[PDB]
Amino acid sequence: TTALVCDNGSGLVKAGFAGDDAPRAVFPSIVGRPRHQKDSYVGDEAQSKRGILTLKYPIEHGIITNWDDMEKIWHHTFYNELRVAPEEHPTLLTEAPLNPKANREKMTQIMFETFNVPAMYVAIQAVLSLYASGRTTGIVLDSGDGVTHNVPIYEGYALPHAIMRLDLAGRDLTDYLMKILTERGYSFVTTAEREIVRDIKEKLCYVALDFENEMATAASSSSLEKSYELPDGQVITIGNERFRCPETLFQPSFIGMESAGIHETTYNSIMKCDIDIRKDLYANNVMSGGTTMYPGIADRMQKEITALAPSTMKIKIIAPPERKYSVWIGGSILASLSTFQQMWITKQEYDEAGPSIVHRKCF
Amino acid sequence: YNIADSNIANLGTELEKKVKLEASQHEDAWKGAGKQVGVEIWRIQQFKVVPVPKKHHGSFYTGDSYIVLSTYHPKTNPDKLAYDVHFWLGAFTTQDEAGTAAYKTVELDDYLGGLPVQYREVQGYESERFLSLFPKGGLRILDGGVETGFHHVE
């Protein structure tokens, strides 16, 4: 019996089989329907036909906000992508911390009542990333398309009082890039155009080590500019947008949020932990998720945390090259362990207890 | 946020500890562990926790990951037992091995009631406590190791 591991990102499904070193199916967590008001398309095919579709994400900031479309995503994952019968596979799902309880209750209900899985578990994403890095103690910064979360973990236990969350991540950065590209006279507005700008962001953006210096460099000459060919063949040029876009992670006021930036929040999370473990957290900051992939982000985090921390603190940022998949990989490892599976909710337990059982078994 | 309304409301509870303690009862490797002063060693082999024979204790394959339980009498009571649990990660160990070693270290900690203190020991970064476990010349690193448990997705 092989378990399935499905990391339902806000932006991307990562799905596959426990014991594999990578997800075998990775595709956009989108449902498309005709832009002019089978009748819908999912995933890669929706992307391929986006010229005629309006695209919608069933997950926003880590929370399922369209359950009917989320069911379509899961059905597509099992039957069209992995081509498995879900009633044959124990299934591991994932979630961001500090989600409302009802989210995992309904995940549990749908997995058992609709897909008839034999067993399932819902894991906290950052915990999986830490194990993927070979650690039991550290502080994870996880940032995908929907959520940026910080989870300090000591001797294998997450410290709930110190967990931080910011509903600011990759989709907000894409939207901001769409906005600031209007200054050059470009117009990216539609859901299909959002996907184009997401690609521009992934290919060309970076985090400046010193933002104000970089702004001056960008005005002094064209040395930082890059060109990009749109799907219609038009070639555009972008300049300081390359680093203004992800600067928002450090300065959330760029999008009108009063929140602390990702450096300050990491620091604040460490400072909520007992003093005697802080050195181990500062030396073990593990980054996971696609929004941690900007070139320069680890060096900027190192610089900013250094400025906040005591002057003698040893600080290290760990940025695994495969960190777009670290959550999934940690799930593949843990779901390969019989003792971890012993904790999973069985179909019989669900039949007798209902959705509330998820809170008594999944930690 | 409001932790009590959230999916982390039960983290840090006695219930969390109880569920994990029960899971740790399902690993044969821990049966009989930590019953007398000494050093017990296991190696991860394709996700499984496999004992290392005593004659090999202190020799570690650079391609592998291990769990080392050191049982000792604490200063507070010469007749009872305390524990340091070290997980040793070879320079060439694969990600499945190191992740399993980490998870199973926590599980052995759970099995022993939370008493062990955990130490992550990467080859070349071993703590003073880890270096002190083996007699003079006793710490030896060996070439190679067992094959990963992962299937490689092409």
Ligand SMILES: Nc1ncnc2c1ncn2[C@@H]1O[C@H](COP(=O)(O)OP(=O)(O)O)[C@@H](O)[C@H]1O
């Ligand atoms: N190289 C990159 N630079 C910046 N952002 C990236 C990069 N690669 C992916 N992303 C962003 O990361 C997000 C997808 O990452 P992922 O961790 O799978 O998110 P999720 O788990 O929420 O689906 C999207 O916002 C995507 O645009």
Ligand SMILES: [Ca+2]
């Ligand atoms: Ca090995």
Ligand SMILES: [Ca+2]
């Ligand atoms: Ca302990």
Ligand SMILES: [Mg+2]
């Ligand atoms: Mg994610």
